[PDB]
Amino acid sequence: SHRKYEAPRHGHLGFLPRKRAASIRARVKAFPKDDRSKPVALTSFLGYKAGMTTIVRDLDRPGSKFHKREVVEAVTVVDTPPVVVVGVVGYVETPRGLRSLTTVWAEHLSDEVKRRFYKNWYKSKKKAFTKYSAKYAQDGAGIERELARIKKYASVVRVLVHTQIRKTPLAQKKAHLAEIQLNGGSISEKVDWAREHFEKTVAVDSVFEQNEMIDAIAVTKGHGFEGVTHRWGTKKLPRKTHRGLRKVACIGAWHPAHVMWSVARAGQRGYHSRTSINHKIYRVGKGDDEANGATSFDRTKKTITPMGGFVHYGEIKNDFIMVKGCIPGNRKRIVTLRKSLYTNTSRKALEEVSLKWIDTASKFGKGRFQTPAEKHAFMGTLKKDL
Amino acid sequence: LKDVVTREYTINLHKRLHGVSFKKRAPRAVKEIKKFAKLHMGTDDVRLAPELNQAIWKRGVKGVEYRLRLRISRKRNEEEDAKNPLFSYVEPVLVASAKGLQTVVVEED
RNA sequence: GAAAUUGUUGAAAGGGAAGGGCAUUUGAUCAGA
RNA sequence: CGUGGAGGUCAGUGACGAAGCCUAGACCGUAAGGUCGGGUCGAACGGCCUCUAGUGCAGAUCUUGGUGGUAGUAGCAAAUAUUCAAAUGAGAACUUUGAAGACUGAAGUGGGGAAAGGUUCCACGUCAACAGCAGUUGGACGUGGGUUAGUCGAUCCUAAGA
RNA sequence: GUGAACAGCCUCUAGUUGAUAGAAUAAUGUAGAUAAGGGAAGUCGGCAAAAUAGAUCCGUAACUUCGGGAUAAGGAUUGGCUCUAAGGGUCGCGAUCAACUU
RNA sequence: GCGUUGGAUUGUUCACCCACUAAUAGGGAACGUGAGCUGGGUUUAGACCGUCGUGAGACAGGUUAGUUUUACCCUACUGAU
RNA sequence: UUUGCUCCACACAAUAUAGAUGGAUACGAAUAAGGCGUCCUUGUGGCGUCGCUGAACCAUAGCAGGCUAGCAACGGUGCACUUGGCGGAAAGGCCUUGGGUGCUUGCUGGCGAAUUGCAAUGUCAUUUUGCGUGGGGAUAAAUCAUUUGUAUACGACUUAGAUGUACAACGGGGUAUUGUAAGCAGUAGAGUAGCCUUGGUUACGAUCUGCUGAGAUUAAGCCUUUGUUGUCUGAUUUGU
Numbered sequence A: 001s002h003r004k005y006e007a008p009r010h011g012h013l014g015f016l017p018r019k020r021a022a023s024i025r026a027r028v029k030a031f032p033k034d035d036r037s038k039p040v041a042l043t044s045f046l047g048y049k050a051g052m053t054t055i056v057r058d059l060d061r062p063g064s065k066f067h068k069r070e071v072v073e074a075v076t077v078v079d080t081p082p083v084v085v086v087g088v089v090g091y092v093e094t095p096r097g098l099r100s101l102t103t104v105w106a107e108h109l110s111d112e113v114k115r116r117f118y119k120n121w122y123k124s125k126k127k128a129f130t131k132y133s134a135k136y137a138q139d140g141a142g143i144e145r146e147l148a149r150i151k152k153y154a155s156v157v158r159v160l161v162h163t164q165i166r167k168t169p170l171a172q173k174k175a176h177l178a179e180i181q182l183n184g185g186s187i188s189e190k191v192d193w194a195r196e197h198f199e200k201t202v203a204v205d206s207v208f209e210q211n212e213m214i215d216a217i218a219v220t221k222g223h224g225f226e227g228v229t230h231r232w233g234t235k236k237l238p239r240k241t242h243r244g245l246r247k248v249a250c251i252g253a254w255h256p257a258h259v260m261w262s263v264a265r266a267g268q269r270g271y272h273s274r275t276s277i278n279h280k281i282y283r284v285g286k287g288d289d290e291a292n293g294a295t296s297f298d299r300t301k302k303t304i305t306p307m308g309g310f311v312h313y314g315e316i317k318n319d320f321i322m323v324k325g326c327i328p329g330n331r332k333r334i335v336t337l338r339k340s341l342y343t344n345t346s347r348k349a350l351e352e353v354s355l356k357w358i359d360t361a362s363k364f365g366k367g368r369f370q371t372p373a374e375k376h377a378f379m380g381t382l383k384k385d386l
Numbered sequence B: 001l002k003d004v005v006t007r008e009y010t011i012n013l014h015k016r017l018h019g020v021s022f023k024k025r026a027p028r029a030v031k032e033i034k035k036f037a038k039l040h041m042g043t044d045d046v047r048l049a050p051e052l053n054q055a056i057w058k059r060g061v062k063g064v065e066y067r068l069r070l071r072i073s074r075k076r077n078e079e080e081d082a083k084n085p086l087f088s089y090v091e092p093v094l095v096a097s098a099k100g101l102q103t104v105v106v107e108e109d
Numbered sequence C: 001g002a003a004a005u006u007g008u009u010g011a012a013a014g015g016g017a018a019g020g021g022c023a024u025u026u027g028a029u030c031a032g033a
Numbered sequence D: 001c002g003u004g005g006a007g008g009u010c011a012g013u014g015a016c017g018a019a020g021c022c023u024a025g026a027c028c029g030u031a032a033g034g035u036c037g038g039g040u041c042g043a044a045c046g047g048c049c050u051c052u053a054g055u056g057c058a059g060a061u062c063u064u065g066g067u068g069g070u071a072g073u074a075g076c077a078a079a080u081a082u083u084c085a086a087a088u089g090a091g092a093a094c095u096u097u098g099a100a101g102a103c104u105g106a107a108g109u110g111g112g113g114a115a116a117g118g119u120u121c122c123a124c125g126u127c128a129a130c131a132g133c134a135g136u137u138g139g140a141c142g143u144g145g146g147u148u149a150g151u152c153g154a155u156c157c158u159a160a161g162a
Numbered sequence E: 001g002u003g004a005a006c007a008g009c010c011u012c013u014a015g016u017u018g019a020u021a022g023a024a025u026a027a028u029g030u031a032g033a034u035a036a037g038g039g040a041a042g043u044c045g046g047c048a049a050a051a052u053a054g055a056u057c058c059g060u061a062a063c064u065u066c067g068g069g070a071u072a073a074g075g076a077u078u079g080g081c082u083c084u085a086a087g088g089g090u091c092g093c094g095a096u097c098a099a100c101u102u
Numbered sequence F: 001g002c003g004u005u006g007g008a009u010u011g012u013u014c015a016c017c018c019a020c021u022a023a024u025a026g027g028g029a030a031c032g033u034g035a036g037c038u039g040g041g042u043u044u045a046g047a048c049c050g051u052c053g054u055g056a057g058a059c060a061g062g063u064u065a066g067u068u069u070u071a072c073c074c075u076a077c078u079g080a081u
Numbered sequence G: 001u002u003u004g005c006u007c008c009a010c011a012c013a014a015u016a017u018a019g020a021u022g023g024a025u026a027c028g029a030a031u032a033a034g035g036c037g038u039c040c041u042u043g044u045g046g047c048g049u050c051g052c053u054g055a056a057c058c059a060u061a062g063c064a065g066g067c068u069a070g071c072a073a074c075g076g077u078g079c080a081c082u083u084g085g086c087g088g089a090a091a092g093g094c095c096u097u098g099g100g101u102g103c104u105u106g107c108u109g110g111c112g113a114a115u116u117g118c119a120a121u122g123u124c125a126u127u128u129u130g131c132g133u134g135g136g137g138a139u140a141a142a143u144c145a146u147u148u149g150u151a152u153a154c155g156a157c158u159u160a161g162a163u164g165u166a167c168a169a170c171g172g173g174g175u176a177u178u179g180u181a182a183g184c185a186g187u188a189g190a191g192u193a194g195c196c197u198u199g200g201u202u203a204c205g206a207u208c209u210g211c212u213g214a215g216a217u218u219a220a221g222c223c224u225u226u227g228u229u230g231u232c233u234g235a236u237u238u239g240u
């Protein structure tokens, strides 16, 4: 008989299976549609989630109860040092989909990216790309032949880039290598851009700008095996329930005489690939710019790094992307920031945000001070120093 | 790594015992001290002086000190079997406080 | 010193049972003349 | 067709190997079955004519015994709690000694008894089985030792009752 | 020792340190806890839990078989320290001795 | 395609009313769903009442109390090698 | 690697065969329309012709195809070289230059075949593997163990580790939590008890005050580090 009281199902069947992602770096499964009139540019970027903080800004939203008023907003900081271009892949269209025709690599690959090709780097003889780099012996005839093939074919061009983890506080030391689609016309010009940028760095400001809507693609934080109550949000069973209450009472009707795929079951929670869209960039800050965390309203000469450092991450010393709100993945995780797949004109996008103040109080507690100078000014002289 | 040598260390038993069950804290301290001596001397055969066991258990099963100053001496042994011809002996140092002390080579005994 | 059941060795087959019937291929094995 | 036993017969087979058993080896019979070879084995047994029956199994939640898959699985999680060193030993988380940390907390995890048990007491030797891990230890195993009354009990008295 | 207490908690004498262990710290459990705001809307039903709780002082209704109801209900106080006062024995007002309770 | 509720009374399905709501549609799945729960009801044994029966006892009448066992196998499902 | 691996050529051994036995012989579109040829005024053009199936086209004779002698013509075809071009949908094929070599049944001769006994597939293809002989080529990793916690029930994941912006253990600094440590001192302290230079002293005293936002703790899943000390070649396995 019927359910006797209607209620929406628990969870989204489109995010199935709730299994562990096959990689710690979530795949970009779609790049922006290519507009072959614009200049050649990366469609995405690689960064590392540093942490969260809060900003204050005046809201520019006519008709709102908070128009021209100050609002406090959570922001996520993504450490984004320049990525190194080390390769270029050509993709030909086939009746079976896109197929990589060939890949041309840079002549010199740094140990950062060479470590990606090894499970035991320290005891290896580090032979990776040693025979390939000889293809640049005298004139690079083989390299130019492969690039000519990419131009003659390969309706889609993607560059191979890798992060510079040595510039992050992470202990990993093994770089993240990814394909980023080159948008901007003239497949020939895409290949020329890739070849010229071989062994060269691309900074995050050449890809993203202030107020832009971007998408964050990352593997969520892992939580291991989870019961249905927190994995799917099902109702806790009553206290009187024998055999436990963090369960789904009826996992199926008599017929079909099978548990169905749509029934909440205990299993892995977290560590899933997610692609969350429409996160507005609030800052495109630069590592070389001391007073990274300053605004035109604050002027306090401070970097984005909170007092004591980003908890479990470290200090931001590179270029960084501050997006509004939160993004999937935990701190220290590699994230991919990609340009929006559509042209959003909604007055939520297209809003020009100007930060008034960025919180740099310690996130290791109820941080009361923005700067060590401010802590000294409030507390006066202490016994050890100050 | 294959010679006789004595050094004084400080072990952060606080961070090694963080969150440990109360009935297992002192036994866990014993095992962490064995692991500590194994890490620092390379010896699987680690022996603890009964005075060191007293120092560990001084405040019962849960009241292990945050820091202990240990004298670890890697020495050689010759017995029925080779069985790791080197072994470590761990003794307490009996200092007033075990704070602000660096690893030092004893150089005398 | 049987069978159930089991180890080893050897032979063979094995996409959600296995086993069976008719027929032949292939491998192994063998009587009759 | 086959089985146990019986009368007759083949002056049947057999320690130079009877019977039994094993044998994707051979032959006969539509079949019940029969025959042969090879291995194993060790003391009896068979063909035919008849006699006779406690004479043929897939079952009966059959009977007795044996054995699986389950499965190296469920589990060995109440009674706060163990640790260091030495000795012994082939072997030590578990034995002994020392050290330390704990508990029972005198309505005891202490010291005795009644019922019951019956040697479990104690020593020496000792670990195949038992102590649902272990074991060099034990209420185990083997061998011994040990219970001393005029006064403590029984014994005597009567009780309900017999 | 605390305390009204053979309660609970800690200790002395005595005894024991015996419960298979080691390593991790997923879900679901068993046992023990906590929780913003709401406060039984949950549920057959306040089941479970929470709240109350000792002692001193105040105050205590209906009803009643006049005995109770009654710890009704409902209030207040409680540590530590330094003091003050009162409460006894024996000997010949004095001398001396002594323990707690308020 | 999408949603179709919070409550008072009743074990209740049903019913009824309060109220919110865009709406408070109807149904199935062994009258879905007890090795998922719960056990208020029904539905053993205790007990009370009314009627009936000479009686033992009866009542699709009322009332009160009344043990809800097992997954470690196979598949299915969820995750994992 | 107790001579390992790979490629090519040859030979020899195996191994099988979803099934060779002359050739899978390439426009596109329409079908109430087309193909081909040709012409021009180049089109949705005129004229001619074809279909009515591949019943075609090509190939096809020679001891399973031998050995030879000529003629004719500079064709056809095989091979290994070679010139250049095109082909990415799974290209791995298509076309083209030049010379060399063999065959040529286009035509005409000479020799051979037997006895496989009147048939017996009467063995002629290609699939993988191994080995040996030569030539050519290259000179790693992965796993276990240790380690990290962005992971995690176990597996799995993600990190690090052979001399360095290396890693670790400590120590230092930052951050953070609590809330002012111990010790010493005080002409602080309700008072009580003594003492005598009766205007002060001694003893006890919760507490108060100062040194003292001090002291303690702080990564165990915080940040950082010109410091101290140490570590850095164990095991197993993998070949086209």
Ligand SMILES: [Mg+2]
Pocket: A002, A003, A004, A005, A006
């Ligand atoms: Mg419905």
Ligand SMILES: [Mg+2]
Pocket: none
């Ligand atoms: Mg949520």
Ligand SMILES: [Mg+2]
Pocket: A240, A241, A242
């Ligand atoms: Mg229950």
Ligand SMILES: [Mg+2]
Pocket: A311, A362, A363, A364, A365
């Ligand atoms: Mg924080």
Ligand SMILES: [Mg+2]
Pocket: B019
């Ligand atoms: Mg914890």
Ligand SMILES: [Mg+2]
Pocket: C001
């Ligand atoms: Mg026998």
Ligand SMILES: [Mg+2]
Pocket: none
């Ligand atoms: Mg058998």
Ligand SMILES: [Mg+2]
Pocket: D004, D054
């Ligand atoms: Mg008989």
Ligand SMILES: [Mg+2]
Pocket: none
């Ligand atoms: Mg015989």
Ligand SMILES: [Mg+2]
Pocket: none
């Ligand atoms: Mg057989």
Ligand SMILES: [Mg+2]
Pocket: none
């Ligand atoms: Mg005999």
Ligand SMILES: [Mg+2]
Pocket: D054
């Ligand atoms: Mg019978």
Ligand SMILES: [Mg+2]
Pocket: none
């Ligand atoms: Mg039978």
Ligand SMILES: [Mg+2]
Pocket: D058, D059
């Ligand atoms: Mg039958």
Ligand SMILES: [Mg+2]
Pocket: none
């Ligand atoms: Mg049976």
Ligand SMILES: [Mg+2]
Pocket: none
């Ligand atoms: Mg049986």
